[PDB]
Amino acid sequence: GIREVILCKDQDGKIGLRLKSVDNGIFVQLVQANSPASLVGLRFGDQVLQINGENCAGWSSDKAHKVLKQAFGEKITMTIRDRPFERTVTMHKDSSGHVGFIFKSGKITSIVKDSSAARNGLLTDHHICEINGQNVIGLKDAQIADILSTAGTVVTITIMPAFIFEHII
Amino acid sequence: QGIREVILCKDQDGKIGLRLKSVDNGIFVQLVQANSPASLVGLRFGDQVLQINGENCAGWSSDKAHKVLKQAFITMTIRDRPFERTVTMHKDSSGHVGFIFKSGKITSIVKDSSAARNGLLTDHHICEINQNVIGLKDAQIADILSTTVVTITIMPAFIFEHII
């Protein structure tokens, strides 16, 4: 469940990352688009186990950022555990195009009876993180709706429990 | 993980061995009785039940799922432990793994350990070792641990406390 990424600092010395301490681990809080971080596949909610061979366990957000800022040379290695708090739910649009849930400020708030969401056991009080391959974090409900409505028929959403989501952010 | 269908037969007394709970408009397994039909077909604490006999459980109360099973003239479609994840560690020279717990909850990670190397988190409840471990005294969990490669299944405390 674990992999290494090698980040190459951009010409300004940056990697496009913000990290956050949660339950004595370190997690990706923000990934800048088109950054060294986005290029190597880092996502919101990824767990950083090691930076340059050193364990992040127990580090504060401030410390993880200081370690990155002072990291020498042009390359930074990180060992990563892929989105541990998230899960994947796959649904299909009814002949009507809906799938079957309501959401508010990025959070799933209702499941529609007898929908694909209900059949697939979609849960409320969970934030939608990505839709069919794309971060929806920080976007407006209206933009989220539009991405959902830009149909695919098959809709795969990745979700995190709201409690956790709210601590990472 | 995806989904799976289990086929269950009530026992000789017409029992299943399950207690269920409504959480986030889903239905979860809150208790599996030792050596029940539920246990035998592989149901575990924290499993999600998506359907019973082909009816969606979405939005059902605990009370409603129970009566449906009592009334059940049983197939269940289930998601495996979706609030949970697994971490694998390797014992120390001294036989340790590298964490401290209290009442089933991991409270600290030992620096420079396998638990640290594998990103084991605090304020998580230990659900299984492999064993199940829910309900056991700490000195008992400690025995299973002591008795090289330790895999544990953990669940964030917030969700664990709500499910029980």
Numbering used by the authors:
A (entry chain A): 113 to 281
B (entry chain B): 112 to 184, 188 to 244, 246 to 262, 265 to 281
The authors write:
Syntenin-1, a member of the PDZ domain-containing scaffold protein family, is involved in diverse physiological processes, such as cell adhesion, protein trafficking, and transcription factor activation. Syntenin-1 is an adaptor-like molecule that contains at least four separate structural domains: An N-terminal domain, two tandem PDZ domains (PDZ1 and PDZ2), and a C-terminal region. The diverse biological functions of syntenin-1 arise from its ability to bind the cytoplasmic domains of numerous physiologically relevant signaling and adhesion molecules, including syndecans, neurexins, and ephrin B12131415. The present study provides clear evidence that syntenin-1 negatively regulates syndecan-4 signaling via binding between syndecan-4 and the syntenin-1 PDZ2 domain.
The crystal structures of syntenin-1 with and without a syndecan-4 cytoplasmic domain peptide (corresponding to the C2 region; 4C2) were determined to be 2.8 and 1.9 Å, respectively. In our structural superpositioning of syntenin-1/4C2 with syntenin-1, the overall RMSD was 1.493 Å. In the absence of syndecan-4 however, the molecular surface of PDZ2 in the syntenin-1/4C2 complex was wider than that of syntenin-1. Upon syndecan-4 binding, a structural rearrangement of the PDZ2 domain provided a specific binding pocket for the syndecan-4 cytoplasmic domain. Indeed, both pull-down assays and gel filtration chromatography showed that syntenin-1 exists as a dimer under physiological conditions. Our structural analysis showed that four residues (Q162 and A169 in PDZ1; R193 and F197 in the linker region) were involved in dimeric interactions with four PDZ2 residues (R199, N232, A230, and R231). Notably, both electrostatic and hydrophobic interactions contribute to the dimerization of syntenin-1.
